[PDB]
Amino acid sequence: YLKIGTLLVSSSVKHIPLMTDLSKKGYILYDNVVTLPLTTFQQKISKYFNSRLFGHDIESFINRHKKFANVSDEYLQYIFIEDISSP
């Protein structure tokens, strides 16, 4: 839980000029904000840290502090530090 935020970044709401650029890398750019797929977000989380010792914690944190650009979809609003930072 403590290290989850170390490799995580806040949603880049004010990155409208860079949201379009980030969309071409695998984001939907819906609602004037970059949104990645829920499966894609899970894959990125499993790549960031060893998935053997990281299970339901990532899913719980995503459900707590991420959105799918709607009431509920197959996307995630969790902004990756290595991706959202880069325009």
Site residues (CB under 8 A) for another protein? Answer: 10-15, 60, 63-64, 70-73
CB of 79 to another protein, least distance (A): 10
Nearer to another protein, 48 or 81 (CB): 81
Nearer to another protein, 43 or 60 (CB): 60
Nearer to another protein, 70 or 86 (CB): 70
Q: Where are the alpha helices (DSSP H) in the chain?
A: 16-23, 38-48, 56-64, 81-84
CB of 37 to another protein, least distance (A): 14
CB 35 within 8 A of CB 77: yes
For residue 72, give the DSSP letter: S
CB 84 within 8 A of CB 70: no
CB of 13 to another protein, least distance (A): 4
CB 68 within 8 A of CB 30: no
